[PDB]
Amino acid sequence: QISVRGLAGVENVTELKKNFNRHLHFTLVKDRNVATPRDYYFALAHTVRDHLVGRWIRTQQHYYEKDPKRIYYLSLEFYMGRTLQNTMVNLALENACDEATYQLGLDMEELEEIEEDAGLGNGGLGRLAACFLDSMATLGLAAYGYGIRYEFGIFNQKICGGWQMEEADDWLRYGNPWEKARPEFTLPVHFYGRVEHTSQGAKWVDTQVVLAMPYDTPVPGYRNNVVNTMRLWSAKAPNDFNLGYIQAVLDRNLAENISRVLYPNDNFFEGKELRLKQEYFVVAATLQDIIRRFKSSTNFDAFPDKVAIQLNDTHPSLAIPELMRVLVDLERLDWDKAWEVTVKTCAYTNHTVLPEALERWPVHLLETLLPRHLQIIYEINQRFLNRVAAAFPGDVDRLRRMSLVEEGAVKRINMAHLCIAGSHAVNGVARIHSEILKKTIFKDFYELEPHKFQNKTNGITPRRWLVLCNPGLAEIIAERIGEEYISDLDQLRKLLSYVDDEAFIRDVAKVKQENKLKFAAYLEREYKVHINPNSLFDVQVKRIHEYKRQLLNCLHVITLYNRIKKEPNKFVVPRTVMIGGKAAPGYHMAKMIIKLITAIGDVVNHDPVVGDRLRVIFLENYRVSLAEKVIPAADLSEQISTAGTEASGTGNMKFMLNGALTIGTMDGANVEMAEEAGEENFFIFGMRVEDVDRLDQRGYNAQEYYDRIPELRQIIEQLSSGFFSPKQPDLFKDIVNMLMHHDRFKVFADYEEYVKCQERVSALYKNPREWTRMVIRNIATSGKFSSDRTIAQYAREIWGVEPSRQRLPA
Template sequence: SSHEFDMEVFSKGDYLQAVEQKVASEMISKVLYPSDSVERGRELRLIQEYFLVACALEDIFKTYLSTHDDFDAFPSKVAIQLNDTHPTLAVAELMRRLMDDHDLSWTQAWEITQATLAYTNHTLLPEALEKWSLPLFEHVLPRHLSLIYDINHRFLQTVTTTWPGDLERMRRLSIIEEGEPKHVRMAHLAIVGSHSVNGVSRLHSELVKTSLVPDFYALWPERFNNKTNGITQRRWLLQANPALAGLITETLGEAWITHLEALRELESQAQDAAFQQAFMEVKQTNKARLAQRIEQTTGVRASPDSLFDIQVKRIHEYKRQSLNLLHIIHTYLRLIEDRTTPPVPRTFIFAGKAAPEYWAAKQLIHMIHSVAEVINNDVRAADWMKVVFIPDYRVSLAEIIIPAADLSEQISTAGKEASGTGNMKFALNGALTIGTYDGANIEICEEVGEDNIFIFGLRAETIETMRRQGTYHPQAYCKREPELARVMAALRSARFCPKTPDLFSWFYNALMEHGDYYFHLADLASYIPAQLHAAEVYTQPALWAQKAILNVARGGKFSSDRTVREYACDIWKIQPVLKGRQ
């Protein structure tokens, strides 16, 4: 907090001006990453990103220089991992510090910068690939822009040497994007300024190379690698699910707490009736706890004896909470119009937050609540369906939700989810995944086995081909599948939004009139039978328990301990300190 206050100005009666500088400086840390829909918001966001980068580097330099007189050892003592493009200003700031503050030559500073920095791309979506307009960048960070111009000039010389006369490739690779106004491409700056570039699942890393930045991959293939995400079992099992952690420790000992691969020994218990009973009793207790929280926060009574079908994550069109909602509508119409009861009662549970300026995401939340209100107040559905949206999603709430899940919804459009970690957390807590062949779902499927996961939907390469060739026609799916047509007709009507008749119109139009960019109808056709199959398996308690136990037992790969080891060994080039050795 700033302490600046101009008493002289205050004494003259200009009270607002007296605190103006204090207010301006404190604004930087009042709200992290404000809306970038207006110029003032974009400027404040850029200032905040620089503030965080500059403070981090100040601390790094202070620590390093306390034991070193020069920068020869800097890359061997310091590793900076750029997580998406938000901290990419570190490229220019590190150069500035080395050149302006410590008088290193451009060549020396650049060698140190590239050897120190590495870049992780966490998503293929535009919001993670920042671009800053040149006028704004020059206004806020003129020295950094001059350094970026220099970096780009030297980089394009390399491009010209590699591909002489290829002006189009040069345009694609340039850090400065042409246009009116021109923009600084922060992802390009991160790649040029780093010695390593990685994605966070095997599929995602391939898409980074083949779809996102293929020209950079062609230039520097040796820089690109994969580091599949992981989660810490000490938070998401030991702390979040103490009853299950206790059962596992009682059965296997404590080795799994620090070496998650030790869970593989649980496979021998998967068909043991006594262990299955103990395992499912833990799940039932966790479901009862969540049901209590649901009633406290929403007023909806969810039966712990129903199948808990859970989708909790950031609200986004590509994550397709909307596809889940289409299946819920289908299930309800089957129950009410066809009088076909589902194999098991089910509670559909949502939670998550939307970015403040993301209109479609906020509309999705409104749509879920509207459908829930209709279904939860229909006595004909009372014994078979409940729909709830738990408010104020946060880590402490996730620690209650995740251990209670029976079915984990991981249903992104294939090729859009970089990895996901929620999928790992749910599986580690004994939930079965229903998901697309996307992100880390693919690797979870490989680890737990195809028989212990419910995979549906188009593959990423198929979707890309259909996009490129223009062969996806959502209306055709409705013509072929009467059940899909009925869902869309209900969506178009005010049946699920009697108080706001136009609530679903934008979504209907997006699907039926504007090409269904996220392939809802293409995947709904296989999502419905996959959901039915999951429900049928759930009616067989011993079989479900076996599959759930195997999901836990085979989750060892997805520990963040493994991920960090890979970063340390492959990118940061550091070795572990062995206990008991100097």
Template sequence: MDARYKSRDIERRSLDVDGLKRSFLEWLVYSVGKDARAATRRDWFHTVALAVRDRVVDRWMDTTRSYYQEDAKRVYYLSLEFLIGRLLTNSLSNLGIVDECRQALDRLGLSMEDVVDAEPDAALGNGGLGRLAACFLDSMASQGLPGYGYGIRYEFGLFEQRFENGWQVEYPEQWLQFGNPWEFARPEVLYPVQFYGRVEEFRDSVGDRAYRWVDADRVLAMAYDTPVVGYGGDTINTLRLWSARATRDFNFGHFNDGAYMKAVEQKILSENLSRVLYPNDATETGKELRLKQEYFFTSASLQDILRRYLQHHTTFENLPNKAAIQLNDTHPAIGIAELMRLLVDQHALRWDDAWEITRATFAYTNHTLLPEALEAWPVRMIERVLPRHMQIIYEINAKFLNRTKARADGDNARLSRLSLIDERGERRVRMGNLAFLGSHKVNGVSALHTELMKQTVFADFHEEFPDRINNKTNGITPRRWLKQANPALSELITTRIGEGWISDLSQIAALRDKADDVVFREEFRRAKRKNKKRLAAYIARQTGEEVLVDSIFDVQVKRMHEYKRQLLNVLHTIALYNEMRDNPTVSWVPVTKVFAGKAAPSYHMAKLIIKLINDVAKVVNHDPSVHDNLKVVLLPNYNVTAAEIIIPAADLSEQISTAGMEASGTGNMKLALNGALTIGTLDGANVEIREHVGPDNIFIFGMTAEEVNDLRASGGFNPREVIASNPSLKRALDMISTGAFSPDDRNRYHPIVQALTDGGDHFLVTADFADYCRAQEAAMHLYRDPEEWTRKAILNTANMGWFSSDRTVNEYAGEVWDVHPVHPNHDGEGFR
């Protein structure tokens, strides 16, 4: 059907207060189906979201139409995770109608905060990698770049964390329970995805060997689209998430009642594919369902990308000029074999042509060097689940190994390191090697991480392809992480330097001068204090604990992981507690230690660390002898929304991973941008943060990545000796091991003490302890001088402009994707 009209025939929704108010009432009554008197907070949230979504749709269609009409090169960001958080404030803010909406609600006697708080978090990610994807979506739309996100519409996002008796307990996160007003279901955008079965060889029309994948199970991928509103509302991009739907194919062969019910059961089970996000951050579990999720969304996305390309083209040689596909980690790396399969098996391209197109289209981002996080699927599993892909991987591998130098030199060790197949023990496919080989560009996420990639996991590949590895230091969107999360500070900034910083964060450098202005410092402190009050109220609500607003808010918020060394922070907390008890007459700087973060449900050590923090909090917070000078809180269920409250209130930002282990970090950037001083190691992007904020405005401590490497190469160290020579460390550890924090179970923390002593202290907690305490003392000392502290805090905010994800995305656009901004035509002339 082809209706004839111009888009200007559609009445565009008004953005003023009256229009919004009218729209709210219409949506409430006619779509939510409630009377204003009966409407709950959630009803109002749905009402407002649907009315706001109206204001996005026409611009969204304009954007999509402009991309189509210009046949623009698009970038496709394939990611198993998008950690989006709430969207209401984000949409309003990017459309520029926050105040209008507040007033419209006001006229209805409603509070904007109440409405905003009724929105659940879209937590379709674990941590940094997923949040980075969400920041990139915001930045691509805000830069006018034709960028699409592709992922999975998990029915259950990252689990909800509660503490029961101090232990982490996981509950399902049912974010879709009451419906999702932001998404548009596209039941007609449906692609088949196959699993299992076998491969049949046959002769094609010209007598060449060809293959088809037969007798496979089929699942359908159905699209749900969420508009991604760019800043200013000019560009509205698309996040397309796939949901698994059963097919209607039936085995009519044995059609009787029993077989019918059995077949339907199978159909129901096939929809489990998109049920739940795997809760692992930087560790892979190797579960078959996870491999199927990876292939499911990758295959559907590639089919969709090729369909879009074929609207304008009849051959594939131009695919790399029209599509850039970015692999967010190796999770979608099976896409390299899948694109080869689609091109060779379904579109009859010659292998070498298909390979050239594939390599020119894909690029791969690596996010970790941790060996336990590098995906390596058992060959036996891929053979069974994706038999044709296993053949293709073998073929890619054989062709590659045949022409490497290593073969010529007879260097078999090197050859086996370059192989896509790890032959040591159970044979496995190294997804990192596949991603590297199938991409024209491979990047790390900070300068240090990229250097280490070249020296370690990809050393052989780097030698083979010296131009392929490049660095793209991560960034964060200033819209969510400063403008929206920190209205107090962002309004202050705007009154002083204008609002240009919101879309060009480099302009925030204009605040540098203001660091020496006493009036500005006072106002900067006032903004921070307001945020600290907000956090204190949140802490009281969440934990029942009262904290001093004038204490140092010392914040460590991130996933719980041994390499991130929450334990180092806990040991310092205990040492400080002891010092305060020993010296009750000293006038201490009050300190509030704020922790938050989830542990992977199967990561026992991380869960034990959670229990330890809660146990330490119980003892410290109720000990009158420290006179409220020290409080410890572990906030439950850290997510994007909690981060938006915690981060603007932080004084001190804990970025204390073992050097060489944190690929980049992005929380470090959010905290520094919001005026927290960093206490950190020279790891990940901390190195670059130091360069930007200046060494005087950051507390760096601990071993460098090189020193860590040398120490490990020389056989490690003896933590027992380090502990024996440091009385405060020894005392803190003794307290943990003798049950000072666990009188009900004195052996509870044996595994932790063991890991830090006889276990060899793999993460060098004891080795860095003394220098960490020195840096902590320097921070506490500085905090006594509010003017100096504030001056440095301002310099942090002023010098963080480079860490905008706009900068990151522009670097990708120029150096990896070759995509350019498109300016959508909003004049209403376009044909629909």
């Protein structure tokens, strides 16, 4: 049907169908009469997975013959989403399978909706990992993603009476056709025990053994026949485990709990034992796999020339003392040499500056669970602190501030400090975030070793985030400039010579109308709710957090509703406001925010006076495959965190790429986005980082805003008096309370300039053709934000490998 989806050759289509019928018969053991759409998805899924394997085997062999430096990306999160379309895309099979399946009298898109998301992450940080792996394959790097194969991913979100209900994400119920279990590479992981000293150094003994079993999942690069591997460990009990007989067997579950469930907090540290075990588990099993692969090529001098370990935040920071452990205790290298190797091997990426999000482990946990690693940590601290003292003599304060060990009621290990000491590079995730690191929380570490600190502004993959979710737009782009930009997104810049082209203007706007028409019909079919598609689609999708300021959005929405009710026969530009995302189960405030958003919808959506000029929809169960739908259909993207709090953001980049305009604050990657499009093509408002600093010095008093702004006073009065919750008038007392006395995020201080900016947004929307020319200016400048650029920067400036766009043979 469409160009970018590749060739549908007679030979390819006839071969596809015969393999589909082979899988339905031999693999699924069904025939046409009994099969359900789920059997059809699986037959297609196995048929597509057949095209991977040859390439998968040839890529693993290529890397053995050629022996290049290997990248190991340790993450506790890989938010993969669905695999079938992405696989077809990267193999150029999309139009072929479509044809083949239409010929068997099936609808391929309806099959695609049966695939479960692999939701092995919470949001941005897990999804960065997924985009990264795609980019690493497309750029021919010899790279491995390592993590944990959780039995249960991010919970599925239900709304009941406007409240969030969490049910378990049993994503493996029907089988995962993409993974290959590999029990032959099972590896022991140790916990507890104690430390013995001998003539021959330290020995860690009397440990409990948990087995780690790997499952490998293919990661195809974009049309270059590279297929890399993501390896996820699963926890297994040993067979003499505890070995009532019955109870002994039942208690095998205790050990296999380690990989059962993904912890559901975004940007919040919870210091639970189970979590620390999961972190140790992935680090221990992965390092032995790494060392084993290094050995099959005695000499660890070349270890850093052959291995790179990237730590995705502090979650796998125990890699550092674990590598020392293996090197010092098991390979018998002396400390100083081991340390040299570790530092040159490891690098660390920070993803936040929020104090509550930093991992800080109780010493009493590590001591029980990992007593040797505690010994190694102390040893690292001592030697570190002697360097600090040598360079800044007499500065006792700096010494306590830099210690990996925090003192106080309960001793903690600051894990961020650990990573800086033991890594050769440390990077933030957008330019303003990297500066903040150097100016504030890592200032002391920067003065000691200025050379470690870098920046690597995030990116997203244009394969999923354009070609896959938006074939309409990809295609009209391709008609004018060719296919090449799919792996070279800078080329989008050539779109700038089409900004005054009448035919392109109409095509950009038509794709956007089509995506809206389709999403509005998804909203009726799957969720029985009725929206006007001629409105401006104003969407905020992302995890629910106070710093993300969903409440600021709520305040805008109430304001519009109030202005409509004040002058009902005045013309307003109609909007559909959509707000979505999960709240972590224990994050009370977050869950109250969700309740507020639906409460506003219960009032606004049923006012006859409002008409369909204003609708508030809470988008239920937000996740990767819902992002693929809503993001293409958006006109306005809301990126309205308080300046200084959102490390980078990546949703911001998804929308820019897909024809939405951005209302946002000067935060994280928003800053470079505006810089790239020019500030005129962006809706920027509110405090800059320095303005927030000015406000903290004299102090934030919210009462002042309540006092000087009647429109805002009225909203608070409405919240308080039970206007949005008539049956429980004091349901929102917590929110009003926080807003008034304890708002760490200065919601009111930005309210006035936000509403004003919102007016300017409505004004451009009134003029379709200028709206669209500005859209073109955004899309045309979105190239910087490709994860291809990001990974090429990691490769040259951190890992020491040259990327390569050359195809491997078929």
